[PDB]
């Protein structure tokens, strides 16, 4: 009647490859509160901000504890993951066994086998099984559960809620193309009829690459070189001038020369949102594009936007659903590593960190 | 009679000590249009933008033409400057003669001992005879009058029209502390009850500097060593945090580190305007303050907020008059050059560019 549990750990802020550990611990089903759940894991994965997390460089962490049975304070890892309910005490009526599930709060810890949480600790998903009964096309997967909850909706509420560009003539553009953020938006610009032009960096099977961004939603495609290149301004302006709108959105998650490229090439009166700094660089803007320009550049932080705005959550929430079950979005792809016991948990996570060069990385059980 | 005038002019773009000569030109005061009025130059001052204006750099230019009497296209040279009325057309009743003006447009050309003008071209001060017949206990100074339209405008515009600082608790911080614009700045902040930092460059008196800036209105003065100290941070801290109010305003004409360091002492949600680039680096911000703080970036261009409001031009240039006449805002002091007729015209503006790094340099008449 007892559960046993695997938790990825740390007790101090460092490289993953150095700090983090597994340990077990228990969980009681047949002494529930009740307003308490029991769920287990179905996937989660490894994003950017998990891991400056645990190097301490991200300001928002979860508190240590001795809650898994450590005699040290140790806190948990990753924010974000699908889980399916095994059990539910005696006043819990807003979940029941199968339901799928995603942490309603940051810090939650994603990376272990189950939790012990409150029914208000979650978010109730529809589960394959409740799509198909609605009569809707399709039924979630895991890799689309367990990513729901970050990536896209920093992709809709960048593109929604802070510039109204006209459906089908105005244009934004975006650093990172090939990212999985950049990837839900080319998706959103294309279903919301925005267009857009994404920049990458150049490789030898560019061509394919190109290929995929446009099926995916972008416009136009460039490289790093045409960005820096005054050249090549002039062919961009001219994509604009033929569409009758104006570049008036600039995404950026790089830094450096980059965030300087993409903001030039906005009309007057342009908005730029960082939102990452893959290159380490800050960002550089000549001091000609804010006064004679009246260019603008300022920050997004999906975790501090939606902290009291439950409400702007679960509507943008409830449209990335929707665009799942039509068949209309589709994910980023994950590299999916299954747990099976042969191999310890904090390990997995550890070359997942280690391979996110090869691409987003997702840890099953 | 015929008067004989003088004006500083270039035919084509350049640095000043190359292009600009002195040409001379005609005025008929027998015949004036009915809405003509013809004044004479009292005072004009060597401004940054007026350098950018004749090197081709500055995207607002008056048109080059042979009115002055040159066999090629000329312009004139000069933004603002302090002029007295000599004779007005017989349907003019807003200037009589000895009245001290304004010009009301940008691209006037203020280079030159006299003009010829529309009525409409000019605004209307009040001078010394009038303040003393109006019973007033101050009248403008030729200093005053002369750059009153741009500096003291922008010190007051950046600081009420993005931000809304409470009185007795909030800051700003400015660097370019020693400047024009910044010494006004730190006037209106104390007569509106902002508190407020001055970044400064250390000098080998600064502690009269610091005296002087304090008694024009600075709470505190640092240099920018301070502004880039580790070390340092926490006492500036202290300041706003024992104050009860936040630091919500930047204020920007340095660029590179400088900027910077004023960014990062911020409370969350802080703006910073760019109004200058003395020292030609770009604006450079780290990706941590846009995200994680909400840091916004903008710019302010006086040139361009005031094109088509005309009434929120003519009360904020009605405030700095009253305050003059009320003895409450002092000027920042000029170094002055009288133009006698025995050095060409030209000349004296070439050595007022020149010698700018001593301080606002004004040729008078
Ligand atoms: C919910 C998810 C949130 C996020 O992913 S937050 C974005 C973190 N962005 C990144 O690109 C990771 C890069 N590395 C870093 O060190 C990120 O913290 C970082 C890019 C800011 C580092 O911040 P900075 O180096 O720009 O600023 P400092 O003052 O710390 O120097
Ligand atoms: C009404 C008055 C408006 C002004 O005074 S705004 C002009 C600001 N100019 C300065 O601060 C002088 C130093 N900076 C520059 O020269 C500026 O114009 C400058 C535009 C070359 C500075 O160069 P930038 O950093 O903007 O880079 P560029 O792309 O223009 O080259
Ligand atoms: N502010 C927020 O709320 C928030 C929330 C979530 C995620 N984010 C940020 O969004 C960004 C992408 O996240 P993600 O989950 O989509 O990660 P991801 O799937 O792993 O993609 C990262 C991409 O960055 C590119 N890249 C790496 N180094 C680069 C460099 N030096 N220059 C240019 N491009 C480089 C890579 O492109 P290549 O194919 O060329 O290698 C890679 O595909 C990150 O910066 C992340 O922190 C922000
Ligand atoms: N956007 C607008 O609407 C607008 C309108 C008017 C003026 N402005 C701008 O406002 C700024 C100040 O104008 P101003 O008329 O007051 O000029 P100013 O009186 O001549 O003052 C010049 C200032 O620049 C500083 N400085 C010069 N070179 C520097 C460097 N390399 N590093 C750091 N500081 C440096 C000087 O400091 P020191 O004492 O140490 O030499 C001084 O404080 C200018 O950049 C001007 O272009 C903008
Ligand atoms: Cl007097």
Redesign the pocket.
């Given at each position: 009647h007892m559960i046993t549990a695997q938790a990825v750990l740390y007790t101090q802020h460092g490289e993953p490859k150095d700090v983090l550990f597994t340990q077990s611990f228990e969980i009681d089903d047949d002494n529930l509160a009740p307003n308490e759940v029991i769920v287990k894991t179905l996937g989660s994965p490894v994003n950017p901000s998990d891991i400056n997390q645990i190097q301490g460089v991200y300001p928002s962490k979860p508190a240590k504890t001795t809650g898994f049975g450590t005699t040290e304070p140790a806190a948990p890892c990753g924010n974000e993951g699908l889980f399916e309910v095994i059990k539910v005490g005696s006043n819990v009526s807003s979940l029941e066994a199968g339901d799928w599930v995603i942490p309603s709060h940051v810090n939650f810890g994603t990376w272990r086998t189950h939790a012990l949480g409150n029914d208000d600790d979650f978010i109730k998903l529809p589960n394959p099984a409740q799509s198909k009964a609605n009569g809707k096309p399709n039924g979630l997967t895991i890799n689309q559960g367990a990513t729901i909850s970050v990536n896209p909706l920093v992709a809709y509420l960048m593109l929604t809620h802070y510039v109204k560009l006209t459906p089908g003539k105005d244009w934004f553009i975006q650093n990172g193309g090939t990212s999985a953020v950049g990837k839900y938006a080319s998706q959103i610009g294309k279903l919301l009829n925005f267009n857009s032009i994404s920049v990458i960096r150049d490789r030898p099977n560019l061509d394919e690459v190109v290929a995929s961004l446009k099926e995916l939603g972008a416009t136009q495609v460039i490289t790093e070189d045409q960005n820096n290149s005054r050249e090549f301004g002039p062919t961009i302006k001219e994509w604009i001038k033929q569409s009758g709108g104006e570049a008036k959105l600039a995404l950026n998650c790089v830094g450096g020369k980059s965030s300087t490229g993409i903001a030039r090439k906005l009309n007057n009166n342009g908005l730029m949102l960082t939102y990452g700094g893959m290159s380490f660089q800050p960002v550089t803007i000549?001091?000609?594009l804010y006064?004679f320009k009246n260019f603008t550049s300022a920050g997004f932080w999906v975790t501090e936007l939606l902290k009291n705005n439950k409400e702007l959550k679960t509507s943008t929430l409830n449209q990335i659903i929707a665009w799942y079950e039509e068949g209309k979005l589709t994910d980023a792809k994950s590299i999916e590593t299954l747990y099976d016991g042969t191999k310890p948990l904090h390990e997995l996570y550890q070359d997942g960190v280690a391979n996110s060069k090869d691409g987003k990385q997702l840890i099953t059980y």
């Open positions: 000549p001091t000609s006064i």
